Write a protein that binds this ligand. Structure first.
Ligand SMILES: *[C@](O)(C(=O)NCc1ccccc1)[C@H](C[C@@H]1CCNC1=O)NC(=O)[C@H](CC1CC1)n1cccc(NC(=O)OC(C)(C)C)c1=O
Ligand SMILES: *[C@](O)(C(=O)NCc1ccccc1)[C@H](C[C@@H]1CCNC1=O)NC(=O)[C@H](CC1CC1)n1cccc(NC(=O)OC(C)(C)C)c1=O
Lengths: 303, 306
């Protein structure tokens, strides 16, 4: 037992990280088979970030303008291609450490591990969620661009995030590995702001189910709720609406604990009303929303 | 910016993890050079666990009595030895993925990464602190024994923890890699409990510095204090004593923020007496004590591993 924010083991991603340099700009790239993926803004100067014309900047670059270093080794760039906001650098070597991998675009509420890297070297690994406002609450300094987010369900690495920017509230925005941004953000230094963030309701419920599996029952009550009355109350606390899909997804945890999904919703309604009155749940004094139903089952019941 | 509970990258350690079977028992081992390290209780069965004679149990064992699997590959065991609560299985093959490493024993308050493993396969990585009561707040299911804790410095893995047991309250106990227990625990099925835990003061102050570096400043105040004054309030609230060495270690963060440890101790003094008054610090409603001063510097300066 016990319950922690757990990341995936990072080794399969560590062997894919490289440094990419173009002019004065250095950041991280991801080397899978014979392609290095990195943010297209590696081709920009620090002035000329307001309104970059990336098509115009890229046509002016030679293969030999990209310095790609994997440890001491310099890789040879033999071709370049832009896909949305990602640059794909063709190199003469397939990475021999390339894992079994897929690219996946995730939905808000989904969790993933981040391997924070500087100069193509790993600094640390932590767990994140795609917020409902399509930001992530990351930990990134100058040099972190091209750091990736991933899951490893079985031996297959699903890459879902590539880091590009920090927004004014100290939260982060980036793309899938096809270079499409999460949310309405652009790779320009123009004024942009995250929408109002909301709590990931289905994840809070999953985490209350974790608490019951780990033997804590103090917050339960004798009440039930309709799905609609739950949403009318939860939205007053800036909680995301709970859908019938979310109710279906919570079915297994419901069956394991013997607590109906709408009985657990009544518990959450009372927690939002009362707070915790000096108590904690799984070591937290706040309601946790960065564990998915699938994360709870994986950590509580066998991996 | 941002601040997250961050683990070390686990790749150097993932290459050392193997499965060890002795009869009915499967758990994890650590394969370094030509030796596999695992918990000595791998030799025990049901009857043995209630009062084990580890000397007497280890005599009756073949080398072929220990199945060691690295992926599909069976390693050949050519020797076995016990060191305190660890078994050392000599194999005929040096691990070609052996990193630069040493074995270190950490102090209460120090943090490390755990690579939670099952059947020799890494499943997850998270950051822990050795609690003042010598437990860790881990997350471990059946099969986790022999999972290890570590720190990295440049390209050197310091192994500090090997997992042995769960206590009541769902906290965890284990050994250093020389098989010495952290805390007053024994590797037998018997009545054991975690002692009263205390809050790691120097780590809470480190995390208040992380808060300030990230623009979370509401708890700062005009007041200062001294050790004796703060420490009399610390003991009061089941906080570890703050030593002069702690004050020195936080030195850098006092400089970088303009808040002297004792000025920050004045902020922490106030938070304990008064509470947080509806507010959060770095997204927590409680005072975080599992970041060391070094962790805060590591994270807020972008230190990388080679
Ligand atoms: C990314 O480009 C990066 O890491 N680049 C390498 C590098 C940058 C700076 C110095 C040396 C090397 C960064 C990552 C950022 C930096 C701080 N934390 C991060 O997550 N991304 C950008 O700088 C990004 C590039 C834009 C998308 C194309 N960018 C540019 C300009 C402004 C901002 N944000 C900003 O001003 O943030 C506030 C909070 C408003 C100060 C930005 O992210
Ligand atoms: C460890 O031995 C292990 O993982 N063994 C492999 C295994 C395979 C299949 C089934 C069980 C075990 C475990 C690790 C435990 C299991 C669950 N969480 C853990 O951290 N350690 C023990 O089982 C340990 C071995 C003893 C020290 C030599 N042990 C034995 C008996 C009792 C407990 N604890 C206990 O009863 O915990 C409470 C909280 C009281 C239920 C114990 O840890």
């Amino acid at each position: 037992s016990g319950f922690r924010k757990m990341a995936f083991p990072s080794g399969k991603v560590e062997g894919c990280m490289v440094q990419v340099t173009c002019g004065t700009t250095t950041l991280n790239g991801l080397w899978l088979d014979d392609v290095v993926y990195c943010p297209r803004h590696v081709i920009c100067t620090s002035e000329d970030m307001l309104n970059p014309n990336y098509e115009d900047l890229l046509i002016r670059k030679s293969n030999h303008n990209f310095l790609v270093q994997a440890g001491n080794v310099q890789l040879r760039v033999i071709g370049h291609s832009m896909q949305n906001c990602v640059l794909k650098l063709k190199v003469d070597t397939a990475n021999p450490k390339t894992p079994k991998y897929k690219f996946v675009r995730i939905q808000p509420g989904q969790t993933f591990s981040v391997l924070a890297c500087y100069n193509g070297s790993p600094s640390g690994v932590y767990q994140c969620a795609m917020r409902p406002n399509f930001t992530i609450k990351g930990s990134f300094l100058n040099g972190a661009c091209g750091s990736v987010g991933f899951n490893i369900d079985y031996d297959c690495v699903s890459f879902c995030y590539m880091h590009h920017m920090e927004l004014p509230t100290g939260v982060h925005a980036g793309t899938d590995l096809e270079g499409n941004f999460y949310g309405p953000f652009v790779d320009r230094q123009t004024a942009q702001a995250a929408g109002t963030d909301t709590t990931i309701t289905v994840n809070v419920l999953a985490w209350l189910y974790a608490a019951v599996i780990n033997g804590d029952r103090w917050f339960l009550n004798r009440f039930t709720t309709t799905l609609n009355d739950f949403n009318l109350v939860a939205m007053k606390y800036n909680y995301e609406p709970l859908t019938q899909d979310h109710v279906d997804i919570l079915g297994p945890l419901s069956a394991q604990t013997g607590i109906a999904v709408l009985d657990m919703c009544a518990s959450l309604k009372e927690l939002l009303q009362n707070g915790m009155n000096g108590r904690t749940i799984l070591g937290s004094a706040l309601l946790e929303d960065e564990f998915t139903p699938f994360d709870v089952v994986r950590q509580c019941s066998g991996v």
